[PDB]
Design a protein around this ligand. Structure first.
Ligand code: IOD
Ligand code: IOD
Ligand code: IOD
Ligand code: IOD
Lengths: 562, 562
C-alpha cells in the first residue's frame, strides 16, 4: 500500500538529502569538516578505548561503522557518532568486573586470537561487544514501542548537570596520564574522591617529565584554541593544532629514547586490522543488563540533545523516535565488528559547527580517512605519549566543562531548576552519569507533581464569574474545592480553559455543585466541551430538563435576566 | 511559647472531644456499638492471627492495645484499629520465611516460654512483632518529614481495586478451612492459582462435614444479614447473628465428639494472658524491611481511606499527617505486647455506621469487653470450629467484595480510570496487595503525565486574543509552541489563567515572542503575574522602555488605538 511505502521511506532519511545534494556549496565545507573531524575521532577513539579497559585499536573501529550506520539512518545533520567517553566509563565497569586484572598473564595467544592481539584482550573486547549489542537491541525495542515521544521528561538542566558531572569524571580519569603514575581500577559510589586520595597518598611516585609534557601541551592547546576563536574574522579557517601537536610529540618521542630514558607511556601497537565479523558472546548477555541499560539511555539522551540543538539552530525538523532506531542499529551492527558502545559527543558537533559542515557527508568523508589510519598510519602511532593524548582530551572537554555558566541563568529565571541542576551535578559527581540522569528525571517529575496542589486553580473575573484555568485532575482536585468554597445568589463557572479531566475532577465539580445548591447559591456552567456534560449528568444524576449547561457566559447572563 | 503549646495540643485530638462529651445522646449508641464491635474484633483477631502464621491468642492482643493508642492519638471517629487481614497476609511471608515449618518439633518449651505456649511459637510471634515495630517506626518517620500531604497520588480507583483484589486473596486463603483439608504454606507471584490447583488435585481429601457446616453457616449468615438491612425500618436494631452462630457452633461441638468422630479443626487453646512487655528482637530488623514497608504503606492507605470517608459523611475535618503518627504509635506500642501489624478494617467501620456510633468511645468500650475475653472467656473458645470462623470471615468480606459495582460508574464517567481499576485488580490478584498499590500509583502518575503533551494549551477568544489556559511546564512546553504557531499584525496573550511555570515555559514563551517578531506580528502580553515579567525580561533581554506587558486586555486594546 501507499502508506506502507511512505513508512518505509520515512525510516531512511538519507533519501531525503542524498538526491538533493549540491556539489557547488556543500562539498568543500563538508570535505574540510571531514578532514578536521578525522583526527578528532581518531584521538578520541584511542583515548576512549583505553578508557573502556580494552585495546586502543578497537576505538578506531568504533569511529568507522556507527558513523556509516547513523549516516544511513540518522536525522541530525551535525551529529558525529563515535566513542563517547560517557558510555566508555559505563562499559569499563562490566569489562573490569567480568574479566579482572588477575588473569593478565598465563594466556594462550592463539586458538582464534583475532588480529595479532594476545589473549585476555579478546576476553575484554567480547564483553564490550556484548554490552554494545544489548544496548543496541534495547534501543531498537524502545523504538518499536514508541517511547521517543516520552522524551520531554528529560529537561535541559538535567542534561546539562549530567554532562558537566560526567566531564568532571572524565577529567579525573585522565589525571594519572598527565601525572605519569599508575593506578588500579578504582570505581564505585565514591570513586571520584578515592582517585584523588590515591593520587595524594602517592605524590612521591609522579613523573616530572610527564607532568611538564602535559602542562606544555595543555598551555599550547588552550592558547591556540582561544586565540583562533577571537581572531576568526582575520583567520577564516580553523588551525589544526591537534594534528601538529600529535606529529611533534611523536617525532620528539622517536628521535630520542623517551620511552626508555625518561620512562614514559605510549600507545602500544595498533595492528593493521578490520578482521572478519563475529557474533557477540550471547552467553554474557545476562550479566551486563544494567550496563546495557545505562549506555542505551545515556548515549541516546546525550545524542538527542545535540540533534535537537542542531535542528533548532539550522531550522529543520527531526524525529525523536528515529534517533532510537539509528543509534540501536549503529550499536547492533558495530557489536559484530569488535566495537565499544557508541554515541554522539558534543566536542565533535562543536567542531562541525566551527568548521562549517552542511550534511552527513562530512561525517562520511572522515570515515574514509579513518580507514587510511587502519591500514597505513596504524603502526605509525607507536610513539605518541599518553600525556599528550590526555592533554588533548582534557582540552577538548572544555565545551562540556563550561556549562557551569548556566547556573547564573537558572538562578535569575527559575531558582527551582537551579536546585535540580545542583542536585543532579552532585549526584553525578558522587555515583555516576546514569544515576545522575535517573535522579534528575525523578526529581523533576516529583517537583512538578508537588506544585499542582499549591497553585491557584480558578480566577475571578470582573452573580460572579469564575474561570477554571487549569485541568482538573487528581493533582489539584482538592485544592480546587477549597479554592471555590473560599470565594463564597448566583455563580457562573466559565469552563473555556477546562480542557481535560478525570474521575476526581468530575466528582469534585459535582460536589461543588451540590454544596452550592445546599447553600442557596446556584451554579451555572459554560462551554464545558461535550464529554464533561455527559460525565457530570451521569455522576450527579443531573436532569436534562433543567438549565445548567450554557453555550457561553453571555448565554448564562441572559438566563439570569428572567 | 504559645505556638509550641498549640502544636503539642494538636497532636492529641482526644482533648478535642473528651471534655465536650455528652452522656445523653452519645453514650447509649456508643455502648451498643462497642458491644457489637467486641465480637467482630474477637473473631477477626483470632482468624487473622491464624492467617498471620502465629498463635490465635495474639490476635486477641492485636484488638486491644492499638485501639487504645488510636483512640488517644487518632482523628477519625468511626475508625476501629485491629488485625486487618491485608497486613497479616504480608507479615505471614516474613514469618514463614524466617521460621519455616521444619523446626516445628524438637523444641524446649521452657527458658522464657511466655504464657504456656511451646517454643517455635515465640519464634514466630517475635518475627511478627519485629515486623510491626519496624512498620511503626517507618510510619513515625513518614510523619516527621511531612509526607502525609503527598497522599493525593493514591486515588479512589486504585484503593478500590487493591482492596477488592486483597479481599479475593483473603477469600482464597480461607478455602481450606471451609473445605476441611490441609495445605502447606503456598505464596508467591502466582499463589492464587496454585492454591486452587492444589484444591482441585486433592479434591478427594475434602471433608463433607466441614463443607456442610460451612455452607449452612454461610447461608444463615447471608440470609440474616440481608433480611435485617431491608427490614431496618421495622427492626430498629442490628441482630447479633455472629454471636448466636458462635455460641450455637461451640455448644453443638461440645455436646458431641465432633472434634474426634467427624474429624474437625477447632480453635486451639487461647490461654489467659497479657504477659509482661518485651522489646522486639532488633537482630531481625534487617530481614523484614520489605514486609515492614508493605504493612506501613498498605495499612495507612486503607485506614486513611476510611477516615476520609467518615469525615466526608459526618462533616468534620481530619489531618492526613496525624493518621501517620497515630498508626505508627499504635504499631510501636503494640509490638512490645506481642502484637501483629495493625490497621483499620472496612467491616468494622461499616458495623459502626450501621449501629450508630458517635465517637471513639465505642472503640474503647469494646476493648473493655476484649479484656473479659482474655481473662474469663479465654478457655471457653476451645470448641469453635474453624469452618464457622471462616464462614464468618468470608461473609464479613462482603463490603470489600461488593466494590465491583464501581466498574459501571468508572466506565460511564472516565474510561481511563476504568482501565487503571482493571490493571490494578489483575496485578493485585497475581502478585499481592502492595504490588497492586505500587502499580496503581505509578500507572496513575504515568497516565496523567502522558496526557499533558496531547491537550490543547491555549484558547482563542472572540488583532486576536489568545488566552493561556494551563500552566507552562516541561510537560506541555512544546505542545504550547505548535499550538500557537498553528493559530497564525497583532496578537494578545491573555495570561490570567497562567499561574505557575518553569524554565521550559519561560524559554518557550520567549521563543514564541521572537518568532512572532520575525514573522512581523507583534505579541502583547497581559497580567503576567509579577515573577513572569522578571523572568521574561531577563531571559529575552527585554527592555523596560518598550510596551510589552500590560495590566489587562483592555489596556492592550487601548494601546492598539495609537
Ligand atoms: I565525550
Ligand atoms: I560518568
Ligand atoms: I480486613
Ligand atoms: I493480599
Amino acid at each position: 500500500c501507499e502508506d506502507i511505502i511512505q513508512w518505509c521511506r520515512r525510516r531512511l532519511p538519507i533519501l531525503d538529502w542524498a538526491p538533493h545534494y549540491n556539489l557547488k556549496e556543500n562539498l568543500l565545507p563538508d570535505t574540510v569538516s571531514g578532514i578536521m573531524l578525522a583526527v578528532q575521532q581518531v584521538t578520541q577513539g584511542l583515548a576512549f578505548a583505553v578508557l573502556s579497559s580494552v585495546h586502543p585499536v578497537f576505538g578506531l573501529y568504533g569511529s568507522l561503522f556507527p558513523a556509516i550506520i547513523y549516516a544511513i539512518f540518522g536525522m541530525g545533520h551535525h551529529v558525529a557518532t563515535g566513542t563517547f567517553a560517557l558510555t566508555s566509563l559505563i562499559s569499563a565497569n562490566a569489562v573490569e568486573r567480568i574479566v579482572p586484572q588477575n588473569m593478565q598473564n598465563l594466556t594462550t595467544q592463539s586458538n582464534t586470537s583475532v588480529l595479532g592481539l594476545s589473549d585476555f584482550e579478546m576476553q575484554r573486547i567480547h564483553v564490550a561487544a556484548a554490552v554494545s549489542f544489548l544496548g543496541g537491541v534495547i534501543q531498537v525495542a524502545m523504538f518499536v514501542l514508541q517511547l521517543g515521544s516520552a522524551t520531554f521528561v528529560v529537561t535541559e538542566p538535567v542534561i546539562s548537570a549530567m554532562t558537566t558531572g560526567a566531564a568532571t569524571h572524565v577529567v579525573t580519569s585522565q589525571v594519572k596520564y598527565l601525572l605519569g603514575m599508575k593506578m588500579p581500577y578504582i570505581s564505585g559510589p565514591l570513586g571520584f574522591f578515592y582517585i584523588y586520595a590515591y593520587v595524594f597518598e602517592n605524590i612521591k611516585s609522579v613523573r616530572l617529565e610527564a607532568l611538564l609534557l602535559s602542562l606544555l601541551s595543555i598551555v599550547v592547546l588552550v592558547l591556540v584554541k582561544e586565540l583562533n576563536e577571537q581572531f576568526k574574522r582575520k583567520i577564516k579557517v580553523v588551525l589544526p593544532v591537534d594534528l601538529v601537536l600529535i606529529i611533534a610529540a611523536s617525532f620528539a618521542c622517536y628521535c630520542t629514547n623517551m620511552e626508555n630514558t625518561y620512562g614514559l607511556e605510549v600507545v602500544g601497537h595498533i595492528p593493521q586490522g578490520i578482521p572478519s565479523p563475529r557474533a557477540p558472546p550471547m552467553n554474557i548477555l545476562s550479566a551486563v543488563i544494567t550496563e546495557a541499560f545505562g549506555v542505551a539511555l545515556v548515549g541516546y539522551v546525550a545524542s538527542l540533545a545535540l540533534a535537537q540543538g542542531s535542528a533548532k539552530k539550522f531550522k529543520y525538523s527531526i524525529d525523536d523516535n528515529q534517533e532510537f532506531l539509528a543509534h540501536g542499529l549503529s550499536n547492533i551492527v558495530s557489536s559484530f565488528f569488535f566495537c565499544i558502545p557508541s554515541a554522539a559527543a558534543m566536542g565533535r558537533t562543536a567542531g562541525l559547527y566551527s568548521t562549517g559542515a552542511k550534511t552527513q557527508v562530512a561525517c562520511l568523508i572522515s570515515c574514509i580517512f579513518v580507514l587510511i589510519v587502519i591500514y597505513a598510519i596504524g603502526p605509525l602511532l607507536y610513539w605518541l605519549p599518553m600525556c599528550v593524548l590526555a592533554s588533548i582530551i582534557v582540552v577538548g572537554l572544555k565545551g562540556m566543562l563550561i556549562q557551569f555558566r548556566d547556573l547564573k541563568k537558572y538562578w535569575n529565571v527559575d531558582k527551582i531548576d537551579w536546585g535540580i541542576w545542583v542536585s543532579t551535578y552532585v549526584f553525578t559527581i558522587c555515583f555516576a552519569a546514569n544515576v545522575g540522569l535517573l535522579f534528575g528525571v525523578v526529581c523533576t517529575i516529583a517537583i512538578v507533581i508537588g506544585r499542582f496542589p499549591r497553585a491557584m486553580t480558578v480566577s475571578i473575573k470582573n452573580v460572579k464569574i469564575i474561570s477554571i484555568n487549569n485541568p482538573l485532575v487528581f493533582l489539584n482536585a482538592k485544592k480546587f474545592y477549597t479554592d471555590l468554597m473560599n470565594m463564597i445568589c448566583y455563580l457562573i463557572l466559565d469552563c473555556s480553559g477546562f480542557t481535560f479531566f478525570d474521575y476526581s475532577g468530575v466528582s469534585m465539580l459535582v460536589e461543588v455543585y451540590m454544596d452550592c445548591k445546599g447553600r442557596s447559591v446556584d451554579v451555572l456552567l459554560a462551554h464545558c466541551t461535550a464529554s464533561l456534560i455527559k460525565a457530570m449528568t451521569y455522576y450527579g444524576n443531573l436532569d436534562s430538563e433543567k438549565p445548567i449547561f450554557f453555550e457561553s457566559v453571555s448565554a448564562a447572563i441572559s438566563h439570569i435576566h428572567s
